[PDB]
Coordinates of C-alpha atoms in Angstrom, one line a residue:
Chain A
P163 CA 13.3 -7.9 -7.6
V164 CA 14.9 -5.1 -9.2
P165 CA 17.2 -3.1 -7.1
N166 CA 18.7 -1.1 -9.9
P167 CA 19.4 2.6 -9.0
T168 CA 20.4 3.1 -12.8
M169 CA 16.7 2.5 -13.6
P170 CA 13.2 4.0 -12.4
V171 CA 11.7 2.7 -9.5
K172 CA 8.1 3.2 -8.5
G173 CA 8.8 4.5 -4.7
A174 CA 6.2 2.1 -2.8
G175 CA 8.2 1.0 0.1
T176 CA 10.2 4.1 1.2
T177 CA 10.8 4.0 4.8
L178 CA 11.8 6.7 7.6
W179 CA 14.2 6.2 10.3
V180 CA 15.7 8.2 13.2
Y181 CA 19.2 7.7 14.7
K182 CA 19.8 6.9 18.3
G183 CA 23.5 6.3 18.4
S184 CA 26.6 8.0 19.4
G185 CA 28.6 7.4 16.4
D186 CA 28.6 9.2 12.9
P187 CA 25.1 8.7 11.1
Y188 CA 26.8 9.7 7.7
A189 CA 29.6 7.0 8.2
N190 CA 27.5 3.7 7.6
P191 CA 24.0 4.5 6.5
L192 CA 23.3 1.4 5.0
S193 CA 23.1 -0.6 8.6
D194 CA 20.1 -0.4 10.7
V195 CA 21.9 -0.8 13.8
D196 CA 21.2 2.0 16.4
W197 CA 18.2 3.6 13.9
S198 CA 14.4 3.3 14.7
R199 CA 11.6 3.1 12.2
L200 CA 8.7 5.5 12.0
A201 CA 6.0 3.3 10.6
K202 CA 2.5 4.0 8.9
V203 CA 3.9 7.0 6.7
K204 CA 0.9 8.1 4.9
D205 CA 2.8 11.1 2.8
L206 CA 6.5 12.2 2.6
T207 CA 8.0 15.2 1.0
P208 CA 11.6 15.4 1.2
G209 CA 13.4 18.8 1.5
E210 CA 14.8 21.0 -1.5
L211 CA 18.2 22.2 -2.1
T212 CA 18.4 25.5 -3.2
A213 CA 20.8 28.5 -3.3
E214 CA 21.0 32.1 -3.3
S215 CA 22.2 34.4 -6.1
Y216 CA 25.1 36.8 -5.6
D217 CA 25.6 39.9 -7.8
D218 CA 28.8 39.9 -9.8
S219 CA 28.3 43.2 -11.5
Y220 CA 31.0 46.0 -11.7
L221 CA 31.0 49.4 -12.9
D222 CA 33.9 48.8 -15.2
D223 CA 32.3 46.0 -17.1
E224 CA 32.3 46.2 -20.6
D225 CA 29.1 44.6 -21.2
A226 CA 26.3 45.6 -19.1
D227 CA 23.3 44.6 -21.3
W228 CA 22.8 41.1 -19.4
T229 CA 22.7 40.4 -15.9
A230 CA 25.6 38.4 -14.4
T231 CA 25.2 36.6 -11.1
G232 CA 27.0 33.5 -9.4
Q233 CA 25.8 30.7 -6.7
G234 CA 25.4 31.9 -3.4
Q235 CA 24.7 30.2 0.0
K236 CA 23.1 26.9 0.0
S237 CA 20.1 25.6 1.8
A238 CA 18.8 22.1 2.6
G239 CA 15.1 23.2 3.0
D240 CA 12.2 21.5 4.9
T241 CA 11.2 17.6 5.1
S242 CA 7.4 17.1 5.7
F243 CA 5.7 13.9 6.2
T244 CA 2.5 12.6 7.8
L245 CA 2.1 9.4 10.0
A246 CA -0.9 7.6 11.6
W247 CA -1.3 9.1 15.1
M248 CA -0.3 6.4 17.7
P249 CA 0.8 7.8 21.1
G250 CA 1.5 4.5 22.4
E251 CA 4.5 3.9 19.7
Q252 CA 7.7 4.5 21.2
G253 CA 8.7 6.3 17.9
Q254 CA 6.1 9.1 18.3
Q255 CA 7.0 9.6 21.9
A256 CA 10.6 10.1 20.8
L257 CA 9.5 12.3 18.2
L258 CA 7.5 14.2 20.6
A259 CA 10.5 14.4 23.1
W260 CA 12.7 15.6 20.2
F261 CA 10.5 18.4 19.4
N262 CA 10.5 19.4 22.9
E263 CA 14.1 19.4 23.7
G264 CA 15.1 21.2 20.7
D265 CA 18.1 19.1 19.4
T266 CA 19.4 18.5 15.9
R267 CA 19.4 14.8 15.1
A268 CA 20.1 12.9 12.3
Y269 CA 17.5 11.0 9.9
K270 CA 17.3 8.6 7.1
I271 CA 14.8 8.0 4.0
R272 CA 15.1 4.6 2.5
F273 CA 14.2 3.9 -1.2
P274 CA 12.9 0.7 -2.8
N275 CA 16.0 0.6 -5.3
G276 CA 18.6 0.2 -2.2
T277 CA 19.8 3.7 -1.8
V278 CA 19.4 6.0 1.5
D279 CA 19.1 9.7 2.1
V280 CA 20.5 11.3 5.2
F281 CA 19.9 14.5 6.8
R282 CA 20.4 16.4 10.1
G283 CA 17.7 19.0 11.4
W284 CA 15.2 20.2 14.1
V285 CA 11.6 19.7 14.5
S286 CA 9.6 22.8 13.8
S287 CA 5.9 21.8 13.5
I288 CA 3.8 19.3 14.9
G289 CA 0.1 19.1 13.9
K290 CA -3.2 16.8 13.9
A291 CA -6.2 16.5 11.8
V292 CA -9.5 14.9 13.2
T293 CA -12.2 13.8 11.1
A294 CA -15.1 11.1 11.8
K295 CA -14.5 8.7 8.6
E296 CA -10.7 9.0 8.5
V297 CA -7.8 7.9 10.7
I298 CA -6.3 10.5 12.6
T299 CA -3.0 11.8 11.4
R300 CA 0.3 13.3 12.8
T301 CA 2.2 16.1 10.7
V302 CA 5.7 16.8 11.1
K303 CA 8.0 19.1 9.8
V304 CA 11.8 19.3 10.1
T305 CA 14.1 22.2 9.3
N306 CA 17.5 20.8 7.9
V307 CA 21.1 22.0 9.1
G308 CA 24.2 21.7 6.9
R309 CA 25.2 19.8 4.2
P310 CA 23.2 16.6 3.8
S311 CA 24.5 13.3 2.5
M312 CA 22.6 12.6 -0.7
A313 CA 22.4 8.9 -2.5
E314 CA 24.8 10.1 -5.3
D315 CA 27.5 10.5 -2.8
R316 CA 27.8 6.8 -2.3
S317 CA 27.3 5.8 -5.9
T318 CA 31.1 5.3 -6.6
Chain B
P226 CA -16.9 -39.7 -15.2
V227 CA -13.6 -39.1 -13.0
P228 CA -13.3 -35.6 -12.9
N229 CA -10.8 -34.0 -15.5
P230 CA -9.4 -30.4 -15.1
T231 CA -7.6 -30.8 -18.8
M232 CA -11.1 -31.0 -20.2
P233 CA -14.2 -28.7 -20.2
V234 CA -17.0 -29.4 -17.4
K235 CA -20.5 -28.1 -17.2
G236 CA -20.6 -26.7 -13.7
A237 CA -23.5 -28.2 -12.4
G238 CA -22.6 -28.9 -8.7
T239 CA -20.5 -26.1 -7.7
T240 CA -20.4 -25.3 -4.1
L241 CA -19.5 -22.2 -2.0
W242 CA -17.9 -22.3 1.4
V243 CA -16.8 -20.1 4.4
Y244 CA -13.9 -20.4 6.6
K245 CA -14.4 -20.7 10.4
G246 CA -11.1 -21.9 11.6
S247 CA -8.0 -20.3 13.1
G248 CA -5.3 -21.6 10.7
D249 CA -4.1 -20.8 7.1
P250 CA -7.1 -20.9 4.5
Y251 CA -4.6 -20.8 1.5
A252 CA -2.7 -23.7 2.8
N253 CA -5.0 -26.6 2.3
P254 CA -8.3 -25.3 0.7
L255 CA -8.8 -29.3 -0.5
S256 CA -10.0 -30.2 2.8
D257 CA -13.4 -29.4 4.2
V258 CA -12.5 -29.4 7.8
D259 CA -13.1 -26.2 9.4
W260 CA -15.5 -24.8 6.7
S261 CA -19.1 -24.3 6.6
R262 CA -21.2 -24.7 3.2
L263 CA -23.6 -22.1 1.8
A264 CA -26.5 -24.4 0.6
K265 CA -29.2 -23.5 -2.0
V266 CA -27.4 -21.4 -4.5
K267 CA -29.4 -20.1 -7.2
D268 CA -26.8 -17.8 -9.1
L269 CA -22.9 -17.3 -8.4
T270 CA -20.9 -14.5 -10.5
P271 CA -17.4 -15.1 -9.2
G272 CA -14.7 -11.7 -8.7
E273 CA -13.2 -10.6 -11.9
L274 CA -9.3 -9.8 -11.7
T275 CA -8.5 -6.5 -13.4
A276 CA -5.6 -4.1 -13.8
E277 CA -5.0 -0.5 -14.4
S278 CA -2.7 1.3 -16.8
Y279 CA 0.3 3.1 -16.0
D280 CA 1.8 5.8 -18.5
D281 CA 5.1 5.4 -19.7
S282 CA 5.8 8.2 -22.1
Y283 CA 8.7 10.8 -21.9
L284 CA 9.6 14.0 -23.7
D285 CA 12.4 12.8 -25.2
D286 CA 10.9 9.6 -26.9
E287 CA 11.9 9.9 -30.5
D288 CA 8.5 8.1 -31.7
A289 CA 5.4 9.5 -30.0
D290 CA 3.2 8.1 -33.0
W291 CA 1.7 5.3 -30.8
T292 CA 0.7 5.3 -27.2
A293 CA 2.8 3.0 -24.6
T294 CA 1.7 1.8 -21.4
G295 CA 2.2 -0.9 -18.7
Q296 CA 0.4 -2.7 -16.2
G297 CA -0.4 -0.9 -12.9
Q298 CA -2.1 -1.7 -9.7
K299 CA -4.2 -5.1 -9.6
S300 CA -7.7 -5.8 -8.0
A301 CA -9.7 -9.0 -7.2
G302 CA -13.4 -7.5 -8.0
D303 CA -16.7 -8.4 -6.3
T304 CA -18.1 -11.6 -5.9
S305 CA -21.9 -12.0 -5.9
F306 CA -24.2 -14.7 -5.3
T307 CA -28.0 -15.4 -4.4
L308 CA -29.4 -18.2 -2.1
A309 CA -32.9 -19.4 -1.2
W310 CA -33.7 -17.2 2.0
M311 CA -33.7 -19.6 5.2
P312 CA -33.2 -17.1 8.2
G313 CA -33.1 -20.2 10.8
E314 CA -30.1 -21.8 9.1
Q315 CA -26.5 -21.4 11.0
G316 CA -24.8 -20.4 7.7
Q317 CA -27.1 -17.5 7.1
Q318 CA -27.0 -16.2 10.6
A319 CA -23.0 -16.5 10.4
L320 CA -23.3 -14.5 6.9
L321 CA -25.3 -11.8 8.8
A322 CA -23.0 -11.5 11.8
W323 CA -20.1 -11.1 8.9
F324 CA -21.7 -8.4 7.5
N325 CA -22.4 -6.6 11.0
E326 CA -18.9 -6.9 12.2
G327 CA -17.1 -5.8 9.1
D328 CA -14.1 -7.9 9.3
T329 CA -12.5 -9.7 6.6
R330 CA -12.9 -13.6 6.1
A331 CA -11.9 -16.2 3.6
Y332 CA -14.3 -17.9 1.2
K333 CA -13.9 -20.7 -1.3
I334 CA -15.8 -21.9 -4.5
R335 CA -15.4 -25.9 -5.3
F336 CA -15.9 -26.7 -8.9
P337 CA -17.3 -30.2 -10.1
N338 CA -13.6 -31.0 -11.8
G339 CA -12.0 -31.2 -8.3
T340 CA -10.6 -27.8 -8.0
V341 CA -11.1 -24.8 -5.8
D342 CA -10.8 -20.9 -5.7
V343 CA -10.1 -19.1 -2.3
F344 CA -10.7 -15.4 -1.9
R345 CA -10.6 -13.3 1.2
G346 CA -13.0 -10.2 1.6
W347 CA -16.0 -8.4 3.4
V348 CA -19.7 -8.2 2.7
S349 CA -20.5 -4.9 1.0
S350 CA -24.2 -5.8 -0.2
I351 CA -27.3 -7.6 1.5
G352 CA -30.7 -7.7 -0.2
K353 CA -33.9 -9.5 -0.7
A354 CA -36.6 -10.3 -3.5
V355 CA -40.2 -10.9 -2.5
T356 CA -42.6 -12.4 -5.2
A357 CA -46.0 -14.2 -4.9
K358 CA -45.1 -16.9 -7.1
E359 CA -41.3 -17.4 -6.4
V360 CA -39.3 -18.6 -3.5
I361 CA -38.0 -15.6 -1.4
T362 CA -34.0 -15.0 -2.3
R363 CA -31.3 -13.6 -0.5
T364 CA -28.5 -11.6 -2.4
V365 CA -25.1 -11.0 -1.1
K366 CA -22.0 -9.3 -2.6
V367 CA -18.6 -9.4 -1.4
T368 CA -15.6 -7.1 -1.9
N369 CA -12.4 -9.1 -2.4
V370 CA -9.2 -8.0 -0.6
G371 CA -5.6 -8.7 -1.7
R372 CA -4.2 -11.8 -3.9
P373 CA -6.6 -14.6 -4.1
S374 CA -5.2 -18.4 -4.6
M375 CA -6.5 -19.6 -8.0
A376 CA -6.9 -23.1 -9.2
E377 CA -3.8 -22.9 -11.6
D378 CA -1.6 -22.3 -8.5
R379 CA -2.3 -25.9 -7.3
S380 CA -2.1 -27.5 -10.9
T381 CA 1.4 -29.0 -10.0

């Protein structure tokens, strides 16, 4: 009802997709052609962008009472999510093949306000939890490579 | 005289039905085809629709003198009723099968003014009361799921 990217949104209805194309995943992320959904998402934690610190001090500085630093190398973090375990689904088979082969692939997060986030990465963890009274869950962690394509890139 | 939904009604003559068909229960609740009646009702407490609160406060709000909230998630509550205990009736056998299976089915309440309320739920309690001087009773509670179909939806 309110797909407004200038106002807060509650985030119910967020979807995860994985690329299966030979083109550029960053060129047109709003299109759902050649993307496959990962359904039944129970929990999602997107990667955090961070940067290291670089020392800017010299012996000749007239002011040395306070530290001075600069921005260093940047990182894209790890994305971690939980699905319902369904080995018969094609998406989870493709996820397991992605872990086994060791490729760096592109994936999307789509938010209810109408914006997408695109990352590239490789899988670094695959887990499971078994409890008598709860549905069995599949846990995934992806390490991101390079510069992502945030929503604010397409704000215009 | 003629039932009138724009005037108060006394409520003597209210009936309770459970769906057996395979179509849409919400499409035409005014028809009794594919519904089974639960006769000999003694008490009926319909489900209560409730909503929870969502906090809408920020640190940069100029005026924190008064609280500010909004409507959160909605619920349909539980519906309770009491019947004369007749284990040989097909309706009560179907009710016990509904409890044992554990699925979600549709049930309607039909009012003396010509209107109907439709809910979907699962049975969460089955009881009995035994007294020497009073007819043995069967007590049932149903937990409702989703958005019901109130009479005001069909007021057109």
